[PDB]
Design a protein around this ligand. Structure first.
Ligand code: CSF
Ligand code: CSF
Lengths: 322, 322
């Protein structure tokens, strides 16, 4: 059972030390957040880091704080005012309305617009009320209760007049009639120039960052005659028996580039339900398949995942991974 | 007139690019906040950094986000729950109740306690209503209106039952009868062991981080026969004609150490109204003097500064710096 201490000055770090002293042997996680980095801050952060179970130094940019911990001189007031950006518009992910609410309030006249957080935006309200998520005290119900509370805040606090979504024609959690819904594709079909799939077929497995998925991935590659793996940005193990694509791009960027260079090629994307399937749903010459290993429980994924994939016309291919 | 974009994923960075594309030549400040650092995040941050006027990558710790931008698997839900700290107590600076309100709400059952932000805590409510701060549209009135709004939030939202102050016997802005006020000194007199000032006198000027203060500082040192300067943690210029103390400690730490080693020495601290004067007000064998250069306007400092210094028994020494 931990105590947290949040500090943004050296003296607050000393105070934090005094508090720790009065609670000897208890567990403390100390956070320092400052815009200034200099010898003294590091010296004092190191000091409190030796005394706490866990400490972190969040580094911020110069000018972030509109507020003052000290009593400013008139000059310091002038400097601060004539430095602050004059902000006309803030764009942020719908759920960042919750996590950065405090900052939005310091710019009450800015026009706010939101964009998809990601595939989280595709779970409808009524789905959070589903029986899956309605057992009191369970992990799934805590998730749903947390989402419902946050969407409510994102939708009704700090008014925003527009939401950009990257998912054409799936109902968005943000579409509540209090804002314009605007489709914002990741590409322009005009610049891509894809034509008829008269050329060949390229098969790619989307790698998983979970290492327990290694054998299952390797078995999928064989079972389905898949030439390539595109590793996940956080994937840290290698897959054998398949050609790994070493590219600097995430899959959507990689595939859009390859389509432009190969406008007649058929790309087949196979995945263990990555959100990239929903993100690439409407890319030309792209055909997504979901893979379902028999050895995983039917409820490995939440029910809305199957429903979005199915609504989106994405086949689910089951296979006995043994 | 700037636009801000806040992002916490790679794809949100692409979206941010699309938005920028639709607003060609306008000014954009882009912020990326993530717990994950890997090749792909840096590649994509660099990319958007080449496209925006200003961009920053705030690095956060692993686990910070209780929320999800994607639809989690059951396994990912389990991992997240069994990782989150069980928090019993949060200590934070009174004004951090405002800036980190969003985080407090994710731990609604934690006991919250606050401590001084700093000398800002010593300006009373009625003082913000002073005539100095009551001219509509001025920089001082915007400051007061901002403080009044934030203290109100800090005092009445997310209930906290106790405030630690480091300033004995000056009225605190947080003392509103909705919390215990607790004095928390920076030292124990029991461990310091200061005795009668039978030894010698040490005179120290507190350096200023403002370089326009250089000549004035150097003239003060001569006029007042001050042996030493203790530079401010952000001071970046050197003072001539005085011995600069090269120490790793801030003044309060330095002086407490020197007192313990020299319990009969008289320390005289001279300052251009540093908050360290108020912080060290009640240190044994310490005698603080405020310095007021004739060449600065009478309103260089705000009126509550003079009043706190005067209430605290701190002489103000005027001198014609020429
Ligand atoms: C905080 C957190 O966990 N974030 C995770 C990310 O670290 C990863 F863990 C995961 O990834 P997941 O659904 O599969 O896919 C998310 C994005 O990762 C890229 N990708 C994925 C697989 C692959 N083989 N090649 C790729 O290039 C695509 O751009 C895709 O749209 C997850 O659920 O495992 O979910 C994402 C976020 O949803 C995403 O990073 C931003 O939209
Ligand atoms: C964000 C921001 O501007 N922060 C500023 C700091 O960078 C500096 F700019 C200033 O400093 P100021 O009142 O003089 O004093 C603040 C603290 O700095 C240390 N000190 C100061 C002068 C000196 N010669 N030797 C020292 O060791 C002491 O610990 C003192 O209590 C300012 O008003 O100029 O105010 C502080 C904060 O109030 C302080 O850092 C935390 O309490």
């Amino acid at each position: 059972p931990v105590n947290l201490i949040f500090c943004y000055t050296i003296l607050q770090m000393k105070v934090a030390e005094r508090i720790m002293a009065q609670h000897p042997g208890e567990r403390f996680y100390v956070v320092l957040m400052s815009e200034n980095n200099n010898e003294k801050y590091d010296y004092y952060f190191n000091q409190i880091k030796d005394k706490a179970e866990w400490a972190y130094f969040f580094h911020l940019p110069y000018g972030l704080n509109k507020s003052f911990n000290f009593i400013p001189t008139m000059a310091e007031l002038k400097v601060k005012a004539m430095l602050l950006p004059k902000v006309k518009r803030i764009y942020l992910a719908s759920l960042e309305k919750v996590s950065i609410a405090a900052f939005l309030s310091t710019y009450p006249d800015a026009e706010i617009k939101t964009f998809d957080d990601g595939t989280i935006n595709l779970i409808q309200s009524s789905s959070y009320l589903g029986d899956e998520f309605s057992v009191n005290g369970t992990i799934k119900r805590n998730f749903a209760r947390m989402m419902i509370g946050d969407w409510s805040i994102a939708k009704t606090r700090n008014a925003s007049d527009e939401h950009y979504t990257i998912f054409k024609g799936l109902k968005n959690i943000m579409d509540d009639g209090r804002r314009k819904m605007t489709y914002l594709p990741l590409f322009d079909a005009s610049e891509l120039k894809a034509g008829d799939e008269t050329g060949g077929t390229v098969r790619i497995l989307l790698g998983s960052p979970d290492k327990e998925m290694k054998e299952i991935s390797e078995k999928a590659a064989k079972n389905f005659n898949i030439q390539y793996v595109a590793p996940h940005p956080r994937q840290t193990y290698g897959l054998s028996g398949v050609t790994t694509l070493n590219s600097p791009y995430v899959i959507e960027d990689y595939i859009l580039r390859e389509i432009k260079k190969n406008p007649h090629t058929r790309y087949e994307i196979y995945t263990f339900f990555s959100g990239a399937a929903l993100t690439m749903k409407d890319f030309p010459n792209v055909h997504v398949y979901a893979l379902k290993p028999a050895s995983l429980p039917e409820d490995y994924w939440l029910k809305p995942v199957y429903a979005l994939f199915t609504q989106s016309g994405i086949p689910i291919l089951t296979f006995d991974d043994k």
